[PDB]
Design a protein around this ligand. Structure first.
Ligand code: HEM
Length: 129
């Protein structure tokens, strides 16, 4: 694709996810049902973004040095990359459901699971440079 925009788009998407994770961690530390539901509503919209089109072949850190942290491995293991993304979506759905139920204990436990999915993908597909 016209490389510039996909790189901006996916970085914006992950940045918003990071912000969401940061806010929900604070809520988990001091559970408040209304704060949890507000963050969940935001996360719900973020998770609706289809990022597949944002990862066209040829946009790795090897192809565009210093402009992205996406490892070439992503395109070498596309099915796994998609599997890891689905795991996050599922874990994220579980967090939203917990927040909407107003269950603090379920919210915290679900948040840990979501965090694990960020790490699982980062470990294999994101540059640590
Ligand atoms: C888990 C909910 C999750 C979070 C949180 C998260 C955050 C995140 C940030 C803050 C970045 C850097 C973005 C920036 O430019 O500032 C980032 C980057 C990448 N991520 Fe991530 N990420 C979470 C989850 C996942 C999952 C489940 C995957 C893989 C299926 C994934 C992948 C990536 C990749 C690739 C990058 C690099 C993108 C680029 O540099 O173009 N992340 N993530």
């Amino acid at each position: 694709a016209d490389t510039k925009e996909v790189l901006e788009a996916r970085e914006a998407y992950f940045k918003s996810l990071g912000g969401s994770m940061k806010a929900m961690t604070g809520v988990a530390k001091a559970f408040d049902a209304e704060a949890a539901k507000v963050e969940a509503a935001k996360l719900e919209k973020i998770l609706a973004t289809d990022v597949a089109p944002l990862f066209p072949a040829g946009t790795s850190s090897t192809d565009l040095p210093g402009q992205t942290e996406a490892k070439a491995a992503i395109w070498a293991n596309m099915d796994d990359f998609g599997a890891k993304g689905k795991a996050m979506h599922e874990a994220g759905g579980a967090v939203i459901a917990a927040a909407n139920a107003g269950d603090g204990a379920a919210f915290g436990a679900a948040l840990q699971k979501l965090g694990g999915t960020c790490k699982a993908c980062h470990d294999d597909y994101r540059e640590e440079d």
